[PDB]
Amino acid sequence: ESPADSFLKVELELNLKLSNLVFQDPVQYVYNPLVYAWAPHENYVQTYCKSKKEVLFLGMNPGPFGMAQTGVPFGEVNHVRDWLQIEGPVSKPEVEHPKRRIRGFECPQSEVSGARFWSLFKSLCGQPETFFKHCFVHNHCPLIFMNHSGKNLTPTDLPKAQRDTLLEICDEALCQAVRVLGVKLVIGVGRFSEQRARKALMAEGIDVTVKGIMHPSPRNPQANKGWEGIVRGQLLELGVLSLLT
Amino acid sequence: SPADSFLKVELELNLKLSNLVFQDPVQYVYNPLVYAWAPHENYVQTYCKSKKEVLFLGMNPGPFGMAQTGVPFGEVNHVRDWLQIEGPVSKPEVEHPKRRIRGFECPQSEVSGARFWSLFKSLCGQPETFFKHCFVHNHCPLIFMNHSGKNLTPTDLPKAQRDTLLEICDEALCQAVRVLGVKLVIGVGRFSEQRARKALMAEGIDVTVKGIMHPSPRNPQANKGWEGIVRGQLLELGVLSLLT
DNA sequence: CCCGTGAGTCCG
DNA sequence: CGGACTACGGG
Ligand SMILES: O=c1[nH]cc(CO)c(=O)[nH]1
Ligand SMILES: O=c1[nH]cc(CO)c(=O)[nH]1
Structure with missing residues (x-):
C-alpha cells in the first residue's frame, strides 16, 4: 500500500487530457512543469509518498518561481534543495516568455509563498519525514498561464469555456x-x-x-503581517498539530 | 585569428539562433550566415587579419545587401568591386516569393550599403586602409519578413520575440x-x-x-547629405585619422 | 530610421 | 491620488 506509483499515474493521466486543449485570447503561453520538471517531481513523489496519507494540502496552480522551476508544489528552490533535498534536471518548456525563463535549480528568485510555506513546516517538524509521515502536498492544476507581457493568469482569470473545461478535468483528477x-x-x-x-x-x-488555511502569497496584506502566526493557529483549531510533531 | 575566433563566435551564435522560433507577424526568417557563409568567411578572412581599434556596428541585414552577399552593409556593386569578395551563395529553405535570394545577381542596389561603402571608398581609397584598424559587423544576422514580404526590423518585432533574440545578440557582441x-x-x-x-x-x-547617423533612405535626415554629416561625425570622434 | 508622447505593470 | 520603466505614427 504505497500510493506513489498510482499518484504519478493520476498525474500522467491528467497531463494527457490537458495536452489536448487549446488556449486563447489573453493566454499566450502555457507551461506544464509536470512534463519539463518531471524528474524532480518524480523524485519528490517517490521519496515522500511512500505510504498513505491522513492530510492533503492543496494549492491552486504553480507560481513562476517555485513549482514552475523545481517541479515540487510550493517549490521554492532553497527549501526544496536544502530541506526536502530534491534535486533533478529540468529542461525548458517548448516556448518561453523571455521575462519567465525556467532556470531550474539555478533560479536566483525566491518565491515568497513557497518559502513561507515550507519554512513553517520546517519549523513545525524539524525533519521532512516528520511532515510527510501523515501528509502530502499537491496542486489542483499543474499548468501555468501567462498573458502577452509575461503577466501571470490564474485559472479564474481565464475566459469561461476553457476555464470550466479545465477545472472540470482537474476536479476529476483531484478525486x-x-x-x-x-x-x-x-x-x-x-x-x-x-x-x-x-x-x-x-x-x-x-x-x-x-x-482551509490562509494563502501565504504576498499579494495578501494580512499575510505580510504574520502569516506563520495565523496559520500555526489555524492548524491548532483543525486538530492537525499533533500529526506534524 | 582574430579571423578564426571571430568566426567561431559567429557559428556559436547561429546555433543559438537555429533554436528559436518566431511567428505572429513574422512569416519568414532568413540567415545569410548560413546560405551565404562562403562570401562571409572570405570577407572575414580577408579583412580581419589583425586586432582592431574601431567596430562599426549595424543593426541587421537588409533584403538586398547582406541578405544577398553575406557582408555587412553588403551592396553588391561595392562588395564585388571595391572589397572584392565573391562566393557561391545558396538560398534560404523557405523564400518569400517577392524576396528570393539571388546573391551576386541581385539587380537591386541597397541604398544604405551603397552609401556606407562609398563613403569609406572615398575616404580611404583601397580597402586595406579602411581595414588596417577597422572592421564592420551587425548586431543581429537574421532577416525577417511579414506575409506580404515587407521587412521587419528587430524593432518592429513584438517584445517577447525581440527580447529573446537581442539578449542572444548582446553575449555575441561581447x-x-x-x-x-x-x-x-x-x-x-x-x-x-x-x-x-x-x-x-x-x-x-x-x-x-x-554613434553615426544611419544611412537608410527611410531616414529623412539621411537623404540630404548623409555623406557630409557622417564625415562630420567621424571627425568629432576622431577616427578620420586612423582612416588615413 | 528617429523621436515623441504614452499605457501596462510593478512596487514581496 | 505616484514613479520608473520601458507601441506606434508623422516627419
Ligand atoms: O543596419 C544595417 N542596414 C543595412 C544593411 C545591408 O545589408 C546592414 O547590413 N545593416
Ligand atoms: O535601396 C533600398 N535599400 C533598403 C531598403 C530597405 O528595405 C529599400 O526599400 N530600398
Whole structure:
C-alpha cells in the first residue's frame, strides 16, 4: 500500500487530457512543469509518498518561481534543495516568455509563498519525514498561464469555456488522487482551493472533510503581517498539530 | 585569428539562433550566415587579419545587401568591386516569393550599403586602409519578413520575440569585442548605438561606444547629405585619422 | 530610421 | 491620488 506509483499515474493521466486543449485570447503561453520538471517531481513523489496519507494540502496552480522551476508544489528552490533535498534536471518548456525563463535549480528568485510555506513546516517538524509521515502536498492544476507581457493568469482569470473545461478535468483528477492517497482531510491553501475542492468531492460524494488555511502569497496584506502566526493557529483549531510533531 | 575566433563566435551564435522560433507577424526568417557563409568567411578572412581599434556596428541585414552577399552593409556593386569578395551563395529553405535570394545577381542596389561603402571608398581609397584598424559587423544576422514580404526590423518585432533574440545578440557582441580587441564601437544608427552601450557596459568591458547617423533612405535626415554629416561625425570622434 | 508622447505593470 | 520603466505614427 504505497500510493506513489498510482499518484504519478493520476498525474500522467491528467497531463494527457490537458495536452489536448487549446488556449486563447489573453493566454499566450502555457507551461506544464509536470512534463519539463518531471524528474524532480518524480523524485519528490517517490521519496515522500511512500505510504498513505491522513492530510492533503492543496494549492491552486504553480507560481513562476517555485513549482514552475523545481517541479515540487510550493517549490521554492532553497527549501526544496536544502530541506526536502530534491534535486533533478529540468529542461525548458517548448516556448518561453523571455521575462519567465525556467532556470531550474539555478533560479536566483525566491518565491515568497513557497518559502513561507515550507519554512513553517520546517519549523513545525524539524525533519521532512516528520511532515510527510501523515501528509502530502499537491496542486489542483499543474499548468501555468501567462498573458502577452509575461503577466501571470490564474485559472479564474481565464475566459469561461476553457476555464470550466479545465477545472472540470482537474476536479476529476483531484478525486482520484484523494482516493489514492487515502486521505481523511484536505486543506486548501487559499479560498479558491478550499472551495474548489469541496465542490469537487461532494459532487462524487467522497466522504472527506475540506478545510482551509490562509494563502501565504504576498499579494495578501494580512499575510505580510504574520502569516506563520495565523496559520500555526489555524492548524491548532483543525486538530492537525499533533500529526506534524 | 582574430579571423578564426571571430568566426567561431559567429557559428556559436547561429546555433543559438537555429533554436528559436518566431511567428505572429513574422512569416519568414532568413540567415545569410548560413546560405551565404562562403562570401562571409572570405570577407572575414580577408579583412580581419589583425586586432582592431574601431567596430562599426549595424543593426541587421537588409533584403538586398547582406541578405544577398553575406557582408555587412553588403551592396553588391561595392562588395564585388571595391572589397572584392565573391562566393557561391545558396538560398534560404523557405523564400518569400517577392524576396528570393539571388546573391551576386541581385539587380537591386541597397541604398544604405551603397552609401556606407562609398563613403569609406572615398575616404580611404583601397580597402586595406579602411581595414588596417577597422572592421564592420551587425548586431543581429537574421532577416525577417511579414506575409506580404515587407521587412521587419528587430524593432518592429513584438517584445517577447525581440527580447529573446537581442539578449542572444548582446553575449555575441561581447564575445566579438573581446575577440577583436576593440577599443571603440560605433553604432550605425541609434538603435545599435544604444543597444551596444547597454550591452558592453553590463559585462563591464573596457570600451567606448559612440554613434553615426544611419544611412537608410527611410531616414529623412539621411537623404540630404548623409555623406557630409557622417564625415562630420567621424571627425568629432576622431577616427578620420586612423582612416588615413 | 528617429523621436515623441504614452499605457501596462510593478512596487514581496 | 505616484514613479520608473520601458507601441506606434508623422516627419
Ligand atoms: O543596419 C544595417 N542596414 C543595412 C544593411 C545591408 O545589408 C546592414 O547590413 N545593416
Ligand atoms: O535601396 C533600398 N535599400 C533598403 C531598403 C530597405 O528595405 C529599400 O526599400 N530600398
